[PDB]
């Protein structure tokens, strides 16, 4: 298909404050959401049916991520901790303590024996899921860390920061394998490996998304037209149908670009506030989006 045609299917209400992140379970059956309301909510990915609320954090949550088998979840909160949850029971299995300020981002590695987190305390931490103890503390950046992501097999970790840098780390040793630098150094608000692990998608707060070939350290594509100079908005690689780049925007729309041509192929209208997060279903052409306080809802969209 030359251009997708996503249409609204469901509007999920429940959160009492701005929504912060939405993620589809790897098995595609669930959608998890975190919010400034200190809660995690689980929803049916196909019927949008509310499943349950997961509570425990003392302050707002900025991110949540799924384990490889869709059974566990990890959340990053302003209470300076991360918590690992058993999705089926809703119980907190462990509380990861170590950061000295807000925990902003988190992810499990493919094996899911590890969790990586980024905090306002300017560090990146690697944790042992089983024990809940901090294995490594990396002096990753000189400003708050906005994103952390493991590559395809978990051998690498990429981080982003308001310090204007994007760095690649060797998971095993914790050593910095590379630093992507810009001469204008605009804050990097988000970063993530491509499904192939060969490229990195990075957002800077100058309304720009870039596709990098980290190894060679060269920018291959740039996506513009959307609005992003204030918040750390998630971006995605959509691969179930055509190959697109999906991102939220500060103009209340969801942008979709053709990855190769960089042309905007569709803009999803409907939210009534900044679309801070978007996620792409693992097998179906389904997009999930979430907005800030004047909206507070999550929307599910589908095309084909």
């Amino acid at each position: 298909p030359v251009k997708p045609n996503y249409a609204l299917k469901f509007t999920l209400a429940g959160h009492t404050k701005a929504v912060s992140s939405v993620k589809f379970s790897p098995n595609g059956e669930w959608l998890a959401s975190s919010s400034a309301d200190k809660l995690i909510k689980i929803w049916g990915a196909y019927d949008g049916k509310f499943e349950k609320t997961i509570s425990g954090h003392k302050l707002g949550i900025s991110d949540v991520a799924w384990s490889s088998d869709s059974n566990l979840l990890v959340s990053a909160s302003d209470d300076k901790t991360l918590k690992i949850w058993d999705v089926s029971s809703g119980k907190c299995l462990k509380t990861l303590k170590g950061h000295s300020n807000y925990v902003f981002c988190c992810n499990f590695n493919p094996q899911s024996n590890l969790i990586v987190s980024g905090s306002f305390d300017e560090s990146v931490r690697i944790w042992d899921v089983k024990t809940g103890k901090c294995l490594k503390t990396l002096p990753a950046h000189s400003d708050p860390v906005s994103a952390v992501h493991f590559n395809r097999d978990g051998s690498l970790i990429v981080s982003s920061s308001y310090d204007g840098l994007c760095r690649i780390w060797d998971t095993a040793s914790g050593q910095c394998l590379k630093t992507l630098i810009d001469d204008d150094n605009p804050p990097v608000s988000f970063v993530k490996f491509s499904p192939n692990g060969k490229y990195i998608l990075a957002a800077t707060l100058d309304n720009t998304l870039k596709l990098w070939d980290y190894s060679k350290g060269k920018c291959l594509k740039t996506y513009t037209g959307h609005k992003n100079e204030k918040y750390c908005i998630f971006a995605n690689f959509s691969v179930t149908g055509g190959k697109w780049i999906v991102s939220g925007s500060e103009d209340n729309l969801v942008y979709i670009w053709n990855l190769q041509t960089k042309e905007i192929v569709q803009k999803l209208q409907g939210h009534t506030d900044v679309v801070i997060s978007t996620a792409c279903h693992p097998t179906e052409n389904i997009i999930a989006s979430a907005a800030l306080e004047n909206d507070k809802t999550i929307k599910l969209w589908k095309s084909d």
């Binding site: 992140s21 400034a36 707002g60 900025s62 991110d63 902003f104 750390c232 801070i276 800030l292 306080e293």
Partner: peptide, 5 residues
Amino acid sequence: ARTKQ
């Protein structure tokens, strides 16, 4: 506080 300022 990602939802924030």
